Amino acid sequence: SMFRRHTVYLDSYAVINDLSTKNEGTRLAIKALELRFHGAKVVSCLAEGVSHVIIGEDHSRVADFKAFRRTFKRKFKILKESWVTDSIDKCELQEENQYL
Amino acid sequence: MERKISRIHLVSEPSITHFLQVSWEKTLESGFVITLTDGHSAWTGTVSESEISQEADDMAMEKGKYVGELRKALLSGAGPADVYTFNFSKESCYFFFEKNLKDVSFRLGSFNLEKVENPAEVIRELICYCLDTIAENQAKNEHLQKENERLLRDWNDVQGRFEKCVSAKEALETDLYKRFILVLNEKKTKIRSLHNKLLN
Amino acid sequence: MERKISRIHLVSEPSITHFLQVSWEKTLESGFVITLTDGHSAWTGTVSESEISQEADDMAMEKGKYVGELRKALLSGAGPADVYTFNFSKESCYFFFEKNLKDVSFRLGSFNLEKVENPAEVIRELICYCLDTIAENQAKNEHLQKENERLLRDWNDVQGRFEKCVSAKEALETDLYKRFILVLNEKKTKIRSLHNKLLN
Predict the structure, then answer these.
(1) Which residue among B48, B84, C14, C100 is least crowded, i.e. fewest CB within 10 A of its CB?
(2) Beta carbons of C187 and B188 less than 8 angstroms apart
C-alpha cells in the first residue's frame, strides 16, 4: 500500500483524453500494470485529480505535458523509469528530486 | 570458403556496370581470387600472400590496415564519406583502384588479370550462387517469422496472466478491508453505547 | 511487376544449365514474359491472355487448372513427385515443355522465342535483380532477429517479475490478518477498561 496516495498517469496514448489511441508499449504497459497492482491508482483520462506523470523514452511529449500543467491548479512531476524500478527494488519510496 | 559479389563502375565506361566477385577461404590475408564480368567477357586473377605482403611493404604502411582498406574497397564496404575509383585497362589487362579524398587521388593496389576463355561458366556459377543464397535467406526468414509469432503469443499470454494476478490481488484486498471495516464499526458502536451508559 | 528465376536442364544440352526468367504484372493469368539464357545468349518471348485462353480451350479445361500447372512447371513450384522436361530447338527457336509420368508424356506448353540483339544487358539485369533481392532479404532478416532478441529479453524479465508478484500475493493476506488482529484487540482492551471503570 506504499502508493496509496500517489496516483500516476502514463503517457501510453498518442492523443490525451482519447481511449481509441492506445499504444503497444512493451515496457510502459507492464510497468503501469505493476504500478496499479502495487496500490497506485492509474487513470486513463487526465483529470484534475492526477498527481504524478510517467513518460517513457519518448521525449517529444514533454513539451505538451509542461504546457498542460501550467493551466492545472496543481502541477504534477515528470519522472523517469529508474524511479519506479528503484522504489520496487528497495521496497521504499525514492525521492523524486533525484528522478525529476 | 565464401565469396562476395558487388557492382563496380569503371571510369572508362561509367554507363555500363560490371560485376566483381571476390572469393576467399577463411580470411583475406591468406589470399583471394577476384573475377570481373560484364555479361559477355570475363577476367580472373588471384592474389596470394607474397604479392599482398610485397605491396604492403612497398607502400610503407602497417599491414594491419592494408587488409582493412582492401576489404572496405573491394567488398563494397565504403562509407558515405569514402569514395573509391577503379580503372581496368583492357589492352594490357591491368586493374588498379584509388581513393578520392580531399580532391586528391591515392593509389591502393595494382593487379594483372588474365582473360577467361569460357565466360559462360563464370556467369552461370554467379547466377546459381545468387539463387542458392536467395533460397537459403527465404528459409531462414520463414523460420525466424515462425519464432517471432511464437514469442508474440507467449508475451500476450504472460500479459494476460499478469492482468489476472493484479485483479485477484485487488479483489482480495477490497474484500478483507470491507470485512474489517464492518467489524470495527460494530466494535465502535458497542464502545459508544457503553460510554453512553457509563455517562449515567 | 513480379519476377521469378529458375534453373532448367534442356534435353538437347544436358551438360549445361539454362536460366528461365518469368515476369508478370499482377497474376500469371494476365500474361508473362519469359527469357531463357545460358550465360552467352538470351532469347525472349511474350505470352498474352489470348494465348493462355486459346491453349486452355484446346485442353478443354478451366483456367485455374492450366494456371496451376504452369505455375508448378515454369515457376519451380514442382511438388514432391512431378517431372517436367524442357526442349529448346535453337534453329527455329521453339521452346516447349511437357509433363512426364511414365512413358506417356504431354506437351503442356509450346512458345516461340526470338534472339536478343544485346545479350549482355539481360544478364546484367538478372544479376542486379538477384543481388537486390539478396540485400533486401538480409536486411529483413536482421531486423526480425533484432526484434526477436528484444522480445525474448522482455519476456525473460517479465516472467521473473510476475513470479515475485505472485510470491508477495500469498504473504499479503497473512500480513492483513495479523494487522487487523492488533487493532481489534486494542478496541477490545478499551472495552475491557471501560467495563472495569463501570464495575464501581
Answers:
(1) C14
(2) yes
Query: Does C165 touch chain A if contact means CB atoms closer than 8 Å?
Result: yes
Query: Per the structure block, which three cell numbers stand in for C45?
Result: 518471348
For C179, the grid coordinates are: 494487522
CB-count exposure of residue C43 (10 Å: 0-12, 13-18, 19+)? buried
- Residue B128 grid cell: 546459381
Provide the number of CB pairs (under 8 Å) joining chain A to chain C: 9
C-alpha to C-alpha distance for C149 and B148, rounded to whole angstroms? 9
- Taking the Cβ of residue A18 and every Cβ of chain C, the question of whether any pair is shorter than 8 Å is answered with no
> C-alpha cell of A81?
523509469
**B109 and B97 Cβ atoms separated by less than 8 Å:** yes
**CA distance linking residue C111 with residue C121, whole number of Å:** 23
Q: Which helix (H) or strand (E) holds A56?
A: none
Q: How many helices (H) and strands (E) does chain A have?
A: 3, 4
Chain A environment of C151 (Cβ under 8 Å): 26
CB of A27 less than 8 A from some CB of C = yes
φ/ψ of residue B92, rounded to 5: -95, -5
Q: How was this structure determined?
A: cryo-EM
Q: Hunting for cell 449515567 — which residue is that?
A: B200
Residues of A in contact with B166 (CB under 8 A): 33, 36-37
- Cβ of A30 under 8 Å from any chain C Cβ? yes
Q: Identify the CA nearest to B155 among candidates C34, C150, C23, C200.
A: C150
